[PDB]
Amino acid sequence: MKIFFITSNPGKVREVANFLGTFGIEIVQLKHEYPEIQAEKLEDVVDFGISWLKGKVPEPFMIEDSGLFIESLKGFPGVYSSYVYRTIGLEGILKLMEGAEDRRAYFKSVIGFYIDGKAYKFSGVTWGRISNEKRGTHGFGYDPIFIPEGSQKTFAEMTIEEKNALSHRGKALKAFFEWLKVNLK
Amino acid sequence: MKIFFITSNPGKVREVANFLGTFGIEIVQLKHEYPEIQAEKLEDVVDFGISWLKGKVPEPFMIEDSGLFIESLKGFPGVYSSYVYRTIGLEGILKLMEGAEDRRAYFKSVIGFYIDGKAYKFSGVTWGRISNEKRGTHGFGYDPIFIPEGSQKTFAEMTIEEKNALSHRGKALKAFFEWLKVNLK
Ligand SMILES: O=P(O)(O)OP(=O)(O)OP(=O)(O)OC[C@H]1O[C@@H](n2cnc3c(O)ncnc32)[C@H](O)[C@@H]1O
Ligand SMILES: O=P(O)(O)OP(=O)(O)OP(=O)(O)OC[C@H]1O[C@@H](n2cnc3c(O)ncnc32)[C@H](O)[C@@H]1O
Ligand code: NA
Ligand code: NA
Ligand code: NA
Ligand code: NA
Ligand code: NA
Ligand code: NA
Structure with a gap:
């Protein structure tokens, strides 16, 4: 099937297309700006986005909201x-984490999917730790830290x-795909 | 006249009431949660807030969105x-500004007012600099830095x-009051 991915992030598109492409799913990116509310939960940002986008973009469509939540920074930057990333950057995070030994953090992804008048959400969480310095040139955003x-890398x-x-x-994609298999055969 | 100030910030209420009270204006705080969109401009956050609040709270009403924009941090934290403040706190800002000599920054306030079916906005900007350490116990939020x-204080x-x-x-209040004098006599 064909799914329109409403996002401005090219990295997210490559990752989604690579994952779902292996199962014959076609992903077409569509940069259509939509309102993102300030909230504590990525889930709330997604709900609002889908409600605003329906009727304005082709179907079916998906959106994604994710963030890096750092323990020693009380969850910051999280939803923001x-x-x-655009203001203080990776350097800012490292500066804030200077000297800290508890560098635990987690990445969370929430995918919203809209089809046949109904919205569905899928999520995935991966715990890890902030490195002491930037490492690697693959991926995007906070990937280097x-x-x-x-894992060591x-x-x-x-x-x-x-x-x-x-x-x-x-993980969010895995949950999304499993849902598609049993629902949108 | 009586104005309902829709906010959860007690400091903002004291400042507004103190200012406008001297002119006979009664300020009644009402903690009614309303959507705050992610945006680049405080003005956009206010516009959205008023549009959502109309018909849900007594009239006339006002709301306010403000932030501290730090030059060396590319405007951060700004709208957020x-x-x-709730996550990395003043300590976070100081840590990020460690060693920096260009500590210029500005505070911006945007007040939204709704009356007789129409919305109006007023703003004020005050440039300054981030201090090297916390100083003072009056006010709220970033006031100590x-x-x-x-000014030296x-x-x-x-x-x-x-x-x-x-x-x-x-400054936003001054503009707001001048507007009231010539419009809501
Ligand atoms: O909202 P869209 O249009 O989809 O693209 P976006 O870049 O604005 O994505 P988000 O608003 O949902 O949150 C983006 C931030 O989260 C970070 N991020 C999310 N997933 C990441 C990943 O897999 N690896 C590294 N950083 C990631 C990244 O640094 C971004 O600045
Ligand atoms: O939105 P309301 O409900 O009115 O209350 P709020 O505390 O959430 O206010 P904002 O969302 O508009 O932005 C709040 C942040 O801006 C900072 N701030 C705003 N005005 C300030 C002032 O005059 N002095 C010090 N800090 C201020 C403060 O530290 C807050 O964390
Ligand atoms: Na998003
Ligand atoms: Na977002
Ligand atoms: Na976004
Ligand atoms: Na506000
Ligand atoms: Na706000
Ligand atoms: Na607020």
Whole structure:
């Protein structure tokens, strides 16, 4: 089937297309700006986005909201991961984490899917830790400073395939695909 | 006249009431949660808030959205000043500004007012610099680390009256009051 991915993030598109493409699903990116509310939960941002987008973009469509939540920073940047990335950057995160030994954090991805007048959500979480310095040139955003649990390499040191197998987005996609198999045969 | 101030911030209420009270205006705080969109401009957050609140709260009513925009941090925390304050706090800002000599920044306040089916906005901006350490116990939020231009004391070292005479909120209120004088006699 064909799904329109409403996003401005090219990295997210590659990861989604790579994952679902292997199952014959066609992903077409569509950069259509939509309202993102300030909220504590990525789920709420997605709900609002879908409600606003319905009737304005082709169907079926999907959107995604994700963030990096750092323990020693009380969850920051979280829902505002994008804004923080564009302002203080990875250097800012590292500066804030200077000297800290508890570098635990988690990435969370929430995918929203809309089809036949109904909305559905899928999520995935991957805990890890913030590295001491930037490492790797693959991926995007915070990938250079995030090491998923059970791995020595940062997301930036992995191929798209390796990242999808361990990331928050990969887990959300797995849940999404399992739902498609039993519902949208 | 009586105005309902839709906010959860007690500091903002004291400052607004103190300012407008001197002109016989009654301010009644009403904690009614309303959607705040993610945006680049405080003005957009206010527009959305008013559009959602109309018909849900008594009239006339006002809301306010403000933030601290730090130059060396590319405007951060800005529109997300509240979230940042609750997570990394003043310590986070100081840590990020460690060693920096260009500590310029500005506070901006945008007040939205709704009456007789129409919305109106008023704003004020006050440039200053981030101090090297926390100073003062008056005010709220970032007051302990913000020194308005032309002053040696941080907002936290001033009385409500002294702060209103120099702050972004005080300027927005001045514009708001001047508008009331010529329109809502
Ligand atoms: O909202 P769209 O249009 O989909 O694209 P976006 O870049 O704005 O994506 P979000 O608003 O949902 O949150 C984006 C931030 O989260 C971070 N992020 C999300 N997933 C990531 C991943 O897999 N690897 C590294 N960083 C990621 C990234 O640094 C971004 O600045
Ligand atoms: O939105 P309401 O319900 O009115 O209350 P709020 O606290 O959430 O206010 P905002 O969302 O508009 O942005 C709040 C942040 O901006 C900062 N701030 C705003 N005005 C300030 C002032 O005059 N002095 C110090 N900090 C201020 C403060 O630290 C807050 O965390
Ligand atoms: Na998003
Ligand atoms: Na977002
Ligand atoms: Na976004
Ligand atoms: Na506000
Ligand atoms: Na706000
Ligand atoms: Na707010």
